[model samples]
Structure formats: C-alpha cells, structure tokens
Target chain A: NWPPEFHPGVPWKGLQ
Target chain B: PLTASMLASAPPQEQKQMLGERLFPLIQAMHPTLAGKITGMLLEIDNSELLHMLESPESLRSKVDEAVAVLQAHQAKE
Candidate 1:
C-alpha cells in the first residue's frame, strides 16, 4: 500500500 | 543483451554461458548516453556494456566502479 512502485525490486531469484 | 549476446562469454560464469542486458545497467550506472544508442535496451539485449565487460573484466570493473562512484556523488550532491 506504499511505495507501490517498488517492492523488493526485482524477483529475489532474478537478482544478483 | 545483444551486445552481450554477440560476443564471447565470461569464464567461470556462475550459471550462464552468455551475459545479457539483464546485467548492463548495473555495470553502466544508468548512463543516459546509452539511450537510442540502440533498442531492447530496456528489455535485455539492448544493454551493450554487459558483453563488453565479459571480454574485459578488469577494466570493466574499474571503469564501472569509477562511474558509479561519480553517479553516487552526483546523486548525493557531494
């Protein structure tokens, strides 16, 4: 419900 | 990732045989200069630097870090 633009960013598995 | 998609591979790749744009922005530090330099850049293949570094690891790291440092400085108004 906040900073809806960002949520953990990308998928954790897709992340570095 | 086409640039990355075009050239060679980084040895000891964690799990990939080839690099991709998925890795470029991190390395490029979001330099706007790359825009319209090509396409799919937003996708994955358009990111060019990813593959360039795979060929020049040492220089790539240094150059990218230096640019990123500058970007941080700019962001923080340092």
Candidate 2:
C-alpha cells in the first residue's frame, strides 16, 4: 500500500 | 476591520465580502505609493482598477496582476 502523501496533486473542489 | 478570527467564523460569501471590503481600502490607499516608488509614474487610481486592466492600467491593475501571479505561482509549486 502507498503512503498517504503519495497521491498526485489535483485541485480540490471547495478550495478556499 | 474584521480580524482573521472574525473572517474565519464567517460564511464563505461573507468571508469574500469582508475580505474584499478590507482589501479595497488598502489597495486604494496603497496603489499610488506602489506606482510612484516602483513605477515612478505618479498618478491617482482606484480599487476597481486593481483587476480591470494592466497597461499598467497606468493604474493598480498591475499590482493586482502581480498579487494573483504570486498566488498562482505558489499554488503551482505546491
């Protein structure tokens, strides 16, 4: 299993 | 002026309005100084000029552009 931080960056909805 | 805590507790649109209100006066007061010290082009300007044009807008539009560019650059790095 990958580490929690391993995901690629993508802009999230409801961004501040 | 609303403190950060006040803004933090506000609803999303209220936060936008409050921040806009706070920023408007600040940029209104600040643009001329920025232009004079940085651009050496002394002139009067208004807050809406901050986002509306950038031939320097001969105005604060350029400052607004610079601020947005800074935000986007930071976003890209993150």
For model 2, report DockQ.
Answer: 0.04
**Model 2, range B28-56, lDDT digits (tens) per residue?**
45554332122211112332342233223
Candidate 1, residues B1-78, lDDT tens digits: the string is: 344424444433321223323344444444444321111122232225545555665755565556445445655764
lDDT of 2 by residue, A1-16 (tens): 1101111122212123
Scored by TM-score, the top model is: 2
Q: What's the residue-level lDDT of B8 in candidate 1?
A: 41
User: Which pairs of residues have clashing backbones in candidate 2?
Assistant: none
User: What are the chain A TM-scores of the candidates, in order?
Assistant: 0.19, 0.24
TM-score of chain B of each: 0.35, 0.39
Estimate the TM-score for candidate 1. Answer: 0.32
Docking class of 2: incorrect
The numbered model that scores best in DockQ is: 1
